[PDB]
Amino acid sequence: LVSKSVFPEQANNNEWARYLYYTGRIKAIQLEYSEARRTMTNALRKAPQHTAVGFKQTVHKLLIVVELLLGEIPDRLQFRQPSLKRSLMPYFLLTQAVRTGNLAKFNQVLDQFGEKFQTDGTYTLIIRLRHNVIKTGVRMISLSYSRISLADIAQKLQLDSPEDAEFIVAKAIRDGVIEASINHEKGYVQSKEMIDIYSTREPQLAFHQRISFCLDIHNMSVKAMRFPPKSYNKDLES
């Protein structure tokens, strides 16, 4: 159905937030974690509204699971503060699990939780989530160090054994977001990162995304700003 795509700006604030969430589910299972994350985040933000309140709790359930699979971590602290707190509560255990680097705690909790998601059809994702905690874990270790031994990574991340630990760290590496190499017969991981934005052009690249996003705001703003006062003078100005 999604292929027709039409959605005007004169659409209501609740219909927009609903629309973003639904697409977000379809993407996430297809294995577009990257695209899925984006649409769902927009949905929470765009409608604060009042009919949205009821919907927002649903958005928060999905929000925490998708974002964790993509590779980024949020804080349990962020979630607790709003008064929609009541729906975030099982969710606090999951956020913490990924962040500490605790594979074993994260998947077991999620398998049992999987039931609730089935109504939504989010459940197929729950299986894939076992991987992401190990990946998040490796990411903090890779950036931090240069060469750190294989035994150290296995203890902190809460990997199954030292034999599990070499294979799994490797799978993350292929994608390239970790950007390392793992020495199996030498039992250390080496950081290919020697990263810095101290370079020639590179800081502009960082600045560029911010600058691009601003344009979308600027145009939307300009176009919109003039049209309501000119109308009221035209018809009933109150």
Binding site: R76, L77, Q96, R99, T100
Partner: peptide
């Protein structure tokens, strides 16, 4: 882990005692 400070009070004490006896 919500706040590192509770855990850290035990960590610093424990870690020093073991480390000192051995190497330092």
């Amino acid at each position: 882990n919500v706040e590192d400070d509770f855990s850290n009070q035990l960590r610093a004490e424990l870690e020093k005692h073991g480390y000192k006896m051995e190497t330092s």
